[PDB]
Design a protein around this ligand. Sequence first.
Ligand SMILES: *C(=C)C1=C(C)[C@@H](Cc2[nH]c(/C=C3N=C(/C=C4\NC(=O)[C@H](C)[C@H]4CC)C(C)=C\3CCC(=O)O)c(CCC(=O)O)c2C)NC1=O
Ligand SMILES: *CCC1=C(C)C(=O)N[C@H]1Cc1[nH]c(/C=C2\N=C(C[C@H]3NC(=O)C(CC)=C3C)C(C)=C2CCC(=O)O)c(CCC(=O)O)c1C
Ligand SMILES: *[C@@H](C)[C@H]1/C(=C/C2=NC(=C\c3[nH]c(C[C@H]4NC(=O)C(C=C)=C4C)c(C)c3CCC(=O)O)/C(CCC(=O)O)=C2C)NC(=O)[C@@H]1C
Ligand SMILES: *[C@H](C)[C@H]1/C(=C/C2=NC(=C\c3[nH]c(C[C@H]4NC(=O)C(C=C)=C4C)c(C)c3CCC(=O)O)/C(CCC(=O)O)=C2C)NC(=O)[C@@H]1C
Ligand SMILES: *[C@H](C)[C@H]1/C(=C/C2=NC(=C\c3[nH]c(C[C@H]4NC(=O)C(C=C)=C4C)c(C)c3CCC(=O)O)/C(CCC(=O)O)=C2C)NC(=O)[C@@H]1C
Ligand SMILES: *[C@H](C)[C@H]1/C(=C/C2=NC(=C\c3[nH]c(C[C@H]4NC(=O)C(C=C)=C4C)c(C)c3CCC(=O)O)/C(CCC(=O)O)=C2C)NC(=O)[C@@H]1C
Ligand SMILES: *[C@H](C)[C@H]1/C(=C/C2=NC(=C\c3[nH]c(C[C@H]4NC(=O)C(C=C)=C4C)c(C)c3CCC(=O)O)/C(CCC(=O)O)=C2C)NC(=O)[C@@H]1C
Ligand SMILES: *[C@H](C)[C@H]1/C(=C/C2=NC(=C\c3[nH]c(C[C@H]4NC(=O)C(C=C)=C4C)c(C)c3CCC(=O)O)/C(CCC(=O)O)=C2C)NC(=O)[C@@H]1C
Ligand SMILES: *[C@H](C)[C@H]1/C(=C/C2=NC(=C\c3[nH]c(C[C@H]4NC(=O)C(C=C)=C4C)c(C)c3CCC(=O)O)/C(CCC(=O)O)=C2C)NC(=O)[C@@H]1C
Ligand SMILES: *[C@H](C)[C@H]1/C(=C/C2=NC(=C\c3[nH]c(C[C@H]4NC(=O)C(C=C)=C4C)c(C)c3CCC(=O)O)/C(CCC(=O)O)=C2C)NC(=O)[C@@H]1C
Ligand SMILES: C=CC1=C(C)[C@@H](Cc2[nH]c(/C=C3N=C(/C=C4\NC(=O)[C@H](C)[C@H]4CC)C(C)=C\3CCC(=O)O)c(CCC(=O)O)c2C)NC1=O
Ligand SMILES: C=CC1=C(C)[C@@H](Cc2[nH]c(/C=C3N=C(/C=C4\NC(=O)[C@H](C)[C@H]4CC)C(C)=C\3CCC(=O)O)c(CCC(=O)O)c2C)NC1=O
Ligand SMILES: C=CC1=C(C)[C@@H](Cc2[nH]c(/C=C3N=C(/C=C4\NC(=O)[C@H](C)[C@H]4CC)C(C)=C\3CCC(=O)O)c(CCC(=O)O)c2C)NC1=O
Ligand SMILES: C=CC1=C(C)[C@@H](Cc2[nH]c(/C=C3N=C(/C=C4\NC(=O)[C@H](C)[C@H]4CC)C(C)=C\3CCC(=O)O)c(CCC(=O)O)c2C)NC1=O
Lengths: 164, 164, 164, 49, 250, 73, 177, 177, 177
Amino acid sequence: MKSVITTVVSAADAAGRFPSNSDLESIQGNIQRSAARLEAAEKLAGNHEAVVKEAGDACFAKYAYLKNPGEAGENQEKINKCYRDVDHYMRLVNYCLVVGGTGPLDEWGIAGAREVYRTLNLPTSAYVASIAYTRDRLCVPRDMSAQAGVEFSAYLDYLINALS
Amino acid sequence: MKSVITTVVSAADAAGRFPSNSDLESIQGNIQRSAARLEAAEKLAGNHEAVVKEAGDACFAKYAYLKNPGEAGENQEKINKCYRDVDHYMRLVNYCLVVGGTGPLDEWGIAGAREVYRTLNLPTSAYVASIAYTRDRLCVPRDMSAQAGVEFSAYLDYLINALS
Amino acid sequence: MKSVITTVVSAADAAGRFPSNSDLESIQGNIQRSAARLEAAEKLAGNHEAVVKEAGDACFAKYAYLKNPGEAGENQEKINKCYRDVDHYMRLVNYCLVVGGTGPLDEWGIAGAREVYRTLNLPTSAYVASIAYTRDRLCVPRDMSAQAGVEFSAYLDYLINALS
Amino acid sequence: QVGNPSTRSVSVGSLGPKVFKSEGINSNAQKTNNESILQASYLAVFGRM
Amino acid sequence: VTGAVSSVNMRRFQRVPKVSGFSAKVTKKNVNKALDKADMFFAKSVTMEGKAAAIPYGVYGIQCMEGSAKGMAHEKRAMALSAAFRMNQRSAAEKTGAMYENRRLALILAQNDHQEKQYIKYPKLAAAALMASTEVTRACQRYAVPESIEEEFLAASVDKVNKMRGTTASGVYKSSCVEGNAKGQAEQARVAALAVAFRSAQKSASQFAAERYAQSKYGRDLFSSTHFEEGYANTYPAMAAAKRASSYGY
Amino acid sequence: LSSGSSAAVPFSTAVRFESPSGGLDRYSRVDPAAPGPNVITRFLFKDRPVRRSDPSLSEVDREATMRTVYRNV
Amino acid sequence: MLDAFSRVVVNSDAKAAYVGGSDLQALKSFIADGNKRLDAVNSIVSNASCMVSDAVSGMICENPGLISPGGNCYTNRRMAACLRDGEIILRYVSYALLAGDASVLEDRCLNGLKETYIALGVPTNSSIRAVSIMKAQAVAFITNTATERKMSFAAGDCTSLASEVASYFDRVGAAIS
Amino acid sequence: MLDAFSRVVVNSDAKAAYVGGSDLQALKSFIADGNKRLDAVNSIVSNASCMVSDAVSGMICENPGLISPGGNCYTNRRMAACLRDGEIILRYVSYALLAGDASVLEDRCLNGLKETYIALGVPTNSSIRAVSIMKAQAVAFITNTATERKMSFAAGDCTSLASEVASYFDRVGAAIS
Amino acid sequence: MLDAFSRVVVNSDAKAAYVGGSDLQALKSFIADGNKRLDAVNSIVSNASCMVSDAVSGMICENPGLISPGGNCYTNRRMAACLRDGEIILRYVSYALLAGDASVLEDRCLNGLKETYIALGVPTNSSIRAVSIMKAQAVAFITNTATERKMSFAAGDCTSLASEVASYFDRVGAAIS
Ligand SMILES: *C(=C)C1=C(C)[C@@H](Cc2[nH]c(/C=C3N=C(/C=C4\NC(=O)[C@H](C)[C@H]4CC)C(C)=C\3CCC(=O)O)c(CCC(=O)O)c2C)NC1=O
Ligand SMILES: *CCC1=C(C)C(=O)N[C@H]1Cc1[nH]c(/C=C2\N=C(C[C@H]3NC(=O)C(CC)=C3C)C(C)=C2CCC(=O)O)c(CCC(=O)O)c1C
Ligand SMILES: *[C@@H](C)[C@H]1/C(=C/C2=NC(=C\c3[nH]c(C[C@H]4NC(=O)C(C=C)=C4C)c(C)c3CCC(=O)O)/C(CCC(=O)O)=C2C)NC(=O)[C@@H]1C
Ligand SMILES: *[C@H](C)[C@H]1/C(=C/C2=NC(=C\c3[nH]c(C[C@H]4NC(=O)C(C=C)=C4C)c(C)c3CCC(=O)O)/C(CCC(=O)O)=C2C)NC(=O)[C@@H]1C
Ligand SMILES: *[C@H](C)[C@H]1/C(=C/C2=NC(=C\c3[nH]c(C[C@H]4NC(=O)C(C=C)=C4C)c(C)c3CCC(=O)O)/C(CCC(=O)O)=C2C)NC(=O)[C@@H]1C
Ligand SMILES: *[C@H](C)[C@H]1/C(=C/C2=NC(=C\c3[nH]c(C[C@H]4NC(=O)C(C=C)=C4C)c(C)c3CCC(=O)O)/C(CCC(=O)O)=C2C)NC(=O)[C@@H]1C
Ligand SMILES: *[C@H](C)[C@H]1/C(=C/C2=NC(=C\c3[nH]c(C[C@H]4NC(=O)C(C=C)=C4C)c(C)c3CCC(=O)O)/C(CCC(=O)O)=C2C)NC(=O)[C@@H]1C
Ligand SMILES: *[C@H](C)[C@H]1/C(=C/C2=NC(=C\c3[nH]c(C[C@H]4NC(=O)C(C=C)=C4C)c(C)c3CCC(=O)O)/C(CCC(=O)O)=C2C)NC(=O)[C@@H]1C
Ligand SMILES: *[C@H](C)[C@H]1/C(=C/C2=NC(=C\c3[nH]c(C[C@H]4NC(=O)C(C=C)=C4C)c(C)c3CCC(=O)O)/C(CCC(=O)O)=C2C)NC(=O)[C@@H]1C
Ligand SMILES: *[C@H](C)[C@H]1/C(=C/C2=NC(=C\c3[nH]c(C[C@H]4NC(=O)C(C=C)=C4C)c(C)c3CCC(=O)O)/C(CCC(=O)O)=C2C)NC(=O)[C@@H]1C
Ligand SMILES: C=CC1=C(C)[C@@H](Cc2[nH]c(/C=C3N=C(/C=C4\NC(=O)[C@H](C)[C@H]4CC)C(C)=C\3CCC(=O)O)c(CCC(=O)O)c2C)NC1=O
Ligand SMILES: C=CC1=C(C)[C@@H](Cc2[nH]c(/C=C3N=C(/C=C4\NC(=O)[C@H](C)[C@H]4CC)C(C)=C\3CCC(=O)O)c(CCC(=O)O)c2C)NC1=O
Ligand SMILES: C=CC1=C(C)[C@@H](Cc2[nH]c(/C=C3N=C(/C=C4\NC(=O)[C@H](C)[C@H]4CC)C(C)=C\3CCC(=O)O)c(CCC(=O)O)c2C)NC1=O
Ligand SMILES: C=CC1=C(C)[C@@H](Cc2[nH]c(/C=C3N=C(/C=C4\NC(=O)[C@H](C)[C@H]4CC)C(C)=C\3CCC(=O)O)c(CCC(=O)O)c2C)NC1=O
């Protein structure tokens, strides 16, 4: 839950200090940038079944080796468990677009994922090819605002970098 | 460099003790198993260019997606670096059969490998698809002796349990 | 309790590893060397009423100044407790041959004994003459086998160097 | 040897018996054949084991 | 203008290293200063990764607070810098004795032969990895709380014989265990240590349960060599965390 | 350390003259693995000069050093 | 820790008895069948990565409310800690099968495991099913009856070592029940 | 630390070679020597309490300036530390003879021992004598030519093992020189 | 410096003993093999220009990054200083073979060689392979087993001089690393 709020409050709690004018000046940027990220949050919250259907079959159009026997996506009950996770990651993008900071992506979807995907033999390049499909399916005047699409694709790039 | 000797010396060095009879009893067990693994070590050194030629195209015929543009092995430079890596792992199994411990694999082939194949986007189930072909092509009474298989197939499975 | 099984597992626990091929090779020395230290275990089990009495007066042959009043050993229950000590010390060597290690002499016989023998005003040189009598009264092919006498007289002079 | 006395210690090669040398030719240079030379010198003197 | 040529003491830095004689004495001194402040970069970089475990997602945890009042953080600076001044006032039996005490403990701690090579060569890297292994897994004596009243008596008996190694052999105090060096400076550390005792009880449910299993590992592969000492470490993890190393005499 | 010292004074001199020359048997700092001169001269028919290379300086090389001090210096 | 040799010694110490021939032949058949014990514990460690992945994904396959929002294995931070705990348990059974005694499992691991898990809210019924899957995995690797991998062994019968590792997975299963 | 088998694979790694059958019988000679090497490191550790009493009491009668007022081994605190360091040095030679390599002697003990003794003020002339007294005590106890005590071995020749342990004892003297 | 004769004198001077007939026969064996020692220094010095070019062009043949731009043996100014440095290492080893003691090599060549290559950036992994090729060249020239140059000697064993000269090449390699 690394916000702009929880960063400057917990850093002021380590010195044992009152909130000073450097702390309040950081929250003034939260009343400047929140119009773009809450626009992109409500655009994702009303269109999410359309975009995780479009993302997940770009993974299996590229990586068609997964539908082989003995591989990962070999029966129907675990292809449905794959789109479960693309819906899980877009929900965490929508949470961190609300709080304005990478915390919901960090401690609920990333912090332990490399231990899990290796042990269950899940290819993390298939997760990248879904998340980096929606970053360049987006076109900035049609789908959201100009600065709403800046901060939306910037939270996808955190998800591409933490898996790659 | 974990072996039979380097375990029992450093266990006595941390304790601050002389070598007693429990330390010399372990080196006696290094004498009896030495005929089986050094038979497997000399079998691997005189055959390795036919082993890693057969292990490497058990990756590139199973996973045929790697020769698409943008993938891991898309040109002959990157294919030759894949056979470079199966030959590096078959050399490190050969050093582990000599020392009698996982020490050569633990420090030159495993430590850092998860943090390298990730950031260079290397599929870690394509290495294990070549090590497990080597472990299954080994018939026992033609290639080596009975307990030369149980040392050679156990160091292959230490590489499989540490990669994936 | 230092032994040959409880120091290769206790060093594999400190690194968080499984028991590897290095760890099973140390246990097979307790298959080959076990038939001699368990061969000297029955011989000490069937002679300890004799050899304790044989080592008890070997102290009193060297030190006849024990039994005088003004000096220490002036009565009977100070004398019969000396055979109580050296029957314990023969029992811990009989424990040491069974475990395949110097475990039971360490924590029960050796540990703390330099404070007990000092503060009770016992001469510590009287103990080591009784132990070193049985290192010399042993002749090797008559009593036990060849490699049982090198195991039995490896814990006796371990006790001698730990005493003084 | 009756017209070339200087040919002693010259290896005849493939037509004579195999010669023996405690050489120890290694980069740490130690002889690896202490076993076999002892096995071969028993046969030079006694001819058998 | 003056005629000001470059000096003889300034042109000597442009000289190429030679290999024997007095010209090897210059290069032996210039490399042993370049290995000394490379060793300081080795100890600084390890502490900057053990401090990244108290910032586990980007926000400052309760482990890395300084003091709670107004001037309770500036005086935590002003007695760490005088703690390092009294560190290099010890004699040669304490500086070299702690170098070999740290080198025994750092090689149990190491995981590969590259790590255990560098703890031998660089002494301050091995001294700042014994402490950096304990501040991560919270196996210290400023982090362990006793969960009984026999456990508080067991850890006070271990901490009774650690307080005599901060005294000398005749029985007087060292300069190793010093609280205050100025007027009223002892009571500021009394305030700052009661504050960090309160934050140790404020840990999470799993943060208390991970350091139960970490203080039992720390007391049984660094300070136990028998089976009876393993019984005092596998059942009472607060006496297994008061077992400090013998480098610092606390 | 006592008498046998230096004067440091980097400036020391004071004059803006035209520069005189050097030798040619100097340390060059470019190609320091070179013979240069003193391979075809009357360097070959003198005895070779003594440079200290031993830390110990044994007592018959101590006397052989100071004979070169009284002869040359 | 203790082992099979040290258990006989500390038993006989309380009677002040010398270790004679009344109880050395139990230890003699421990060593004489000792080459099957190293043939047993090699087969567990050679499959120990797949024996946690077949375990805790079959535990969720029989109790699918563990990955529900609120469950114990919901986030990636929590699924990784169960996969961590699924191979600390298999490691100390491997330390107990090799030593032939369950004192390395009892004191170092199971002391305070039940009083840990009730301060964290781990479900103490589905955790038994991840253990009891692994007991069925191990005894098909001891007796070479796993249906996907066949390891090459010598001929003979080793049913007493499949029943000892089955006795070790119940000391952990009764520790948190 | 290294041993004999790990020394010959860090040299084959440097030229990227497999350890084939050309330098394997250099290692097969180490295994056939193994019962003599194990028979012989038992000889030093059985007598090691007397080998440090025979060494540092020989040094104080050859040099009686050590028990002079202000010496190195003058007071009762300093005599116990010299008695400690004689057994530390003998302990690391015993690890080197058992391993077959001087790697554990060189770094864990000898690296930094010279400027330790420079900063402490140990006279380094006396320490060469007291480690060469123990070198003579080692090769008397290896090859069974000790006058007051004889040990029961099998018959054979072990002068290569006695000259290998003498190679480690003057490696101590070269480091502190 | 010292040789093999005055090494025995300084070991005997520390005990104030006359060197007598009990250890003169290990110096009479130095004299009786003294023709083969000179026979072997002649075989190294006759081939020493070819030994330092088969070495440092085999160091380039196994590490092509030295002749890459920015490398250590890149330009002509730098390759000539490596080829100079090969024949000072070979020159000081043959002074120590001829003396039978390595103390000219340790006091005039390996005294600050490590601290000079650190301040120059000479790669120490490649300056072991230059020395360890030259060790294998010397042992092939002592024992007369070089393939491209056969010489003529009288019959008899000389592997005790090839093993002494191999251990002088393991002190060049163990002082710069
Ligand atoms: C790449 C193009 C390349 C190499 C790789 C490297 C090959 C190489 N050669 C040796 C060994 C020797 N060189 C020797 C020198 C000479 N041989 C002669 O007879 C003449 C007199 C002289 C050269 C003109 C010798 C004697 C040897 C020893 C082996 C032998 O039997 O001849 C090595 C060393 C092996 C090792 O790594 O230990 C290598 C790598 N040279 C290249 O140019
Ligand atoms: C978790 C520990 C930590 C990391 C990592 C970090 O970057 N900062 C600390 C927490 C922290 N500390 C402060 C402020 C101060 N800390 C000190 C004491 C330290 N400074 C020193 O020079 C020394 C001796 C080497 C110590 C221990 C002091 C004096 C301050 C300043 C207090 C003040 O009132 O100015 C802060 C706040 C700084 C910020 O703006 O982020 C934090 C987060
Ligand atoms: C790992 C790849 C090993 C291996 C492990 C074994 N697993 C064994 C049994 C087993 N399998 C299941 C199925 C479970 N996995 C799923 O994905 C799902 C559905 C979502 C389920 C239900 C269960 C429940 C069990 C345990 C049976 C029980 O509860 O008692 C097993 C033993 C049986 C056998 O092999 O015949 C092993 C050894 N198997 C392998 O071969 C590789 C090496
Ligand atoms: C589709 C891209 C892949 C694929 C997907 C699978 N993912 C599986 C399991 C899994 N994923 C997570 C992380 C995810 N779950 C969460 O709850 C959250 C956020 C809170 C995230 C990011 C977990 C924890 C799990 C395990 C539990 C589960 O079944 O949901 C998974 C199951 C593992 C298995 O069947 O062995 C699959 C199959 N894998 C494929 O087959 C295609 C290629
Ligand atoms: C911008 C001019 C692009 C471009 C855009 C097209 N997109 C089309 C359909 C489409 N795109 C998305 C993803 C988008 N919608 C969302 O709701 C969100 C996230 C909140 C995103 C990123 C969806 C779901 C759809 C389907 C229907 C729709 O909502 O528009 C589209 C129609 C044809 C097609 O499907 O490809 C176009 C032309 N294409 C371009 O050439 C530029 C670069
Ligand atoms: C073949 C089955 C693989 C594959 C392999 C590739 N590996 C590439 C680079 C690479 N691999 C390693 C690990 C390996 N090298 C070593 O030196 C050692 C240990 C001694 C090991 C185990 C390293 C360190 C590197 C980087 C350095 C190098 O290039 O050798 C690689 C090139 C990736 C790139 O473009 O940077 C490939 C293509 N690729 C395949 O198709 C299968 C998965
Ligand atoms: C336990 C390991 C030691 C011990 C250490 C002391 N820590 C002291 C101050 C201090 N430590 C931290 C934690 C922070 N420093 C680090 O180096 C790392 C990791 C690399 C971390 C997380 C902080 C923030 C502070 C400042 C004081 C405060 O918390 O308010 C310290 C000096 C003060 C004191 O005496 O408490 C010591 C001695 N203490 C022990 O008892 C064992 C030996
Ligand atoms: C997985 C099969 C379980 C489940 C497990 C969880 N365990 C969690 C934490 C945890 N586990 C242990 C015990 C373990 N650590 C040890 O060191 C040893 C023995 C030496 C053992 C047996 C501890 C001490 C802890 C706390 C430390 C930590 O944070 O890992 C855990 C995390 C809780 C959370 O963050 O939410 C989980 C999820 N939950 C399950 O569904 C199955 C039944
Ligand atoms: C006696 C044979 C010597 C002599 C010895 C003294 N050594 C003294 C202190 C000392 N020695 C060491 C090195 C030792 N400790 C280690 O941990 C290791 C390697 C693992 C070694 C070799 C250290 C670190 C110290 C100082 C710490 C301490 O007190 O133990 C010493 C005490 C000096 C004093 O207080 O007077 C003495 C007398 N002196 C001699 O000249 C003969 C040759
Ligand atoms: C070549 C096999 C090396 C390598 C060598 C380089 N050395 C360079 C300069 C240099 N070398 C020495 C040591 C040498 N001089 C001596 O007097 C003695 C012993 C008596 C020895 C071994 C010194 C002192 C110097 C500096 C002064 C000088 O050059 O005369 C050098 C030049 C550096 C540059 O300009 O780039 C090189 C390249 N580099 C290699 O890769 C291999 C390993
Ligand atoms: C240090 C490494 C090391 C090992 C890994 C083992 C390897 C090993 N296992 C066995 C030998 C054996 N192993 C088995 C075991 C089995 N056979 C089956 O049919 C069961 C499926 C399976 C149980 C796991 C049997 C039955 C024997 C032969 C009988 C016996 O040894 O008592 C033997 C032969 C012993 C002999 O010939 O006397 C060896 C060397 N030993 C070692 O020294
Ligand atoms: C001031 C007078 C005085 C001395 C001169 C010394 C006596 C002394 N003894 C030994 C030499 C020795 N010391 C021992 C040790 C022992 N022998 C045993 O059989 C026992 C088990 C153990 C001692 C209890 C051994 C084995 C030798 C080797 C020579 C030998 O005795 O055969 C040496 C080494 C010889 C050398 O310098 O190379 C010296 C100097 N001690 C003194 O107090
Ligand atoms: C736990 C403690 C422990 C030990 C002490 C050794 C014990 C030991 N020493 C030797 C065995 C032997 N030891 C020697 C050694 C010697 N003979 C000499 O003349 C020299 C004086 C001396 C060494 C310095 C020889 C020559 C043999 C027989 C050769 C051989 O075993 O191959 C053997 C082999 C038995 C035999 O084959 O007869 C054993 C088990 N092993 C252990 O596990
Ligand atoms: C001024 C320069 C000068 C020399 C170079 C040597 C040259 C030299 N070497 C040998 C003589 C010898 N040289 C060898 C040497 C060898 N045989 C081998 O198999 C090895 C390959 C090789 C050396 C490494 C042997 C074995 C002898 C005869 C044994 C002996 O030394 O008497 C002899 C004969 C000595 C005699 O008459 O008995 C001479 C003169 N002496 C000198 O005065």
